[PDB]
């Protein structure tokens, strides 16, 4: 019979008031003989009726992919409300119930520190700028780079790593042409996290 996977919303969607966060209940392995899926949604054990089902998607391996989407309020998610998706389908001996919420724990404020390239890296055509973000909880975060208002796309960010104090840390590395750094251009690391003032901070870097 079918299987169920329940996905949280993107940190960005939850941390920006101008965005719309949603939890997503994906049901895969739905048969051609029994395509009908009944969804029941609960928020802290209380049923809600505003979910919407996505268009049925044929997978070409004998099965359907059926997706129900539930809009959630920013504060509800961030306050740690539990969202439950219950799935019923004829090929199932018993309904499948999943549950997600923000990770439990007293939230903690990321410290953001910028790190200029090593003098020994100045041999290459390109240099590395670092943004160290440590001491945050939970692990839900967003990290980006900008210069002169425009976003800088040439970066890579590590996944969050559990530190010895039970908070997370990560590094983000922005790679730029050496000349841009030499010329005194300012680069900024933008971090979004629930425990920052207004869910946002920014640190800058130049020679």
């Amino acid at each position: 019979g079918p299987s169920v996977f329940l996905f949280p919303p993107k940190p960005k969607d939850t941390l920006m008031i101008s965005r719309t966060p949603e939890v997503t209940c994906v049901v895969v392995d739905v048969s051609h003989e029994d395509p009908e899926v009944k969804f029941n949604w609960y928020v802290d054990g209380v049923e809600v009726h505003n979910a919407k089902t996505k268009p049925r998607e044929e997978q070409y391996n004998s099965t359907y992919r059926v997706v129900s989407v539930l809009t959630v309020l920013h504060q509800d998610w961030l306050n740690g409300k539990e969202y439950k998706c219950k799935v019923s389908n004829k090929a199932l001996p018993a309904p499948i119930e999943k549950t997600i919420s923000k990770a439990k724990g007293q939230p903690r404020e990321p410290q953001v520190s910028t790190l200029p390239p090593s003098r020994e890296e100045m041999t290459k055509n390109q240099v590395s700028l670092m943004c160290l973000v440590y001491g945050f909880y939970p692990s839900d975060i967003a990290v980006e780079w900008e210069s002169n208002g425009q976003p800088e796309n040439n970066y890579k960010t590590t996944p969050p790593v559990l530190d010895s104090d039970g908070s997370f840390f990560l590094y983000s590395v922005l790679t730029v042409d050496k000349s841009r750094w030499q010329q005194g251009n300012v680069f900024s690391c933008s971090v979004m996290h629930e425990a920052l003032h207004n869910h946002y901070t920014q640190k800058s870097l130049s020679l």
Binding site: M16, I17, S18, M192, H197, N198, H199, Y200
Partner: peptide, 13 residues
């Protein structure tokens, strides 16, 4: 006050 990111509203308190 309010926070902005690339000319888009993040949050206000």
């Amino acid at each position: 006050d309010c926070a902005w990111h690339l000319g888009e509203l993040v949050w206000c308190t």
